[PDB]
């Protein structure tokens, strides 16, 4: 049973590390799209601030 548990541990660590690298790629791409989303949000924010100042003046 020690050897059986060792084999269980080996394919378990294989599958969890595969899922882990998948998760790393996923978190990286969503962090990137977080950067673009924040950039677009702030862009729209100050663009509308400027146009509203122009409207009031």
């Amino acid at each position: 049973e020690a050897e059986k548990a060792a084999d269980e541990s080996e394919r378990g660590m294989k599958v969890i590390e595969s899922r882990a690298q998948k998760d790393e790629e996923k978190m990286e791409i969503q962090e990137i799209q977080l950067k673009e989303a924040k950039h677009i949000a702030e862009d729209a924010d100050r663009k509308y601030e400027e146009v509203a100042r122009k409207l009031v003046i």
Partner: protein
Amino acid sequence: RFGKFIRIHFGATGKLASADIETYLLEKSRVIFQLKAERDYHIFYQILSNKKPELLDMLLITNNPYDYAFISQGETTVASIDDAEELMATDNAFDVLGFTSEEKNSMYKLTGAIMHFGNMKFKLKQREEQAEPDGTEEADKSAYLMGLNSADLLKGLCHPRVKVGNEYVTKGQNVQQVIYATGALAKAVYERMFNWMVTRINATLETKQPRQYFIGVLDIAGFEIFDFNSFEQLCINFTNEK
């Protein structure tokens, strides 16, 4: 590059007895780092000669010099000397020498193993600064050639064992350190091969005559000057100045 040195021995009655040969100051930096407009040692280019097909297929050598990383950095080829008949002449000289062809084949296979050390690749791990390999086919073929185990060699490269007091412990290595170790091993094995070859040549040349006072003959590289001087030229200049 290397500082060839031959000692010519004489008999007791002032008659020629024997010759002793030694080598000094062989440069290892040429093996790994080459200038943009300069080549490496003629060995690797000579092995890539196509007139001997058996060596290439038995060693599983890629016939394209461009693919190999250690060679393609420098200038690929020049019309210095036609490599083919030079390689055949060296092979004939080895064949007519004292040792058999199995040693020659070991020499070629060891050189091929040195060639495949540049294909090793390493990448970072999951959540650690440790480095792990990604590809293993080149590692597998190199281990097969050296008669080692690929898993053991990879474990040794990634996790070098060191002795502390009375107990062994394992050390961690990142990508930069493992690349430096890979280069150092390739340089060291080449140095050992060259020294062993020189010892074999000296033994074969050796006669049974007694060695009284000798006459030394020394050959050394000159005080080379370039417009792009570097460390290799610095060592040569310092030796010439001494």
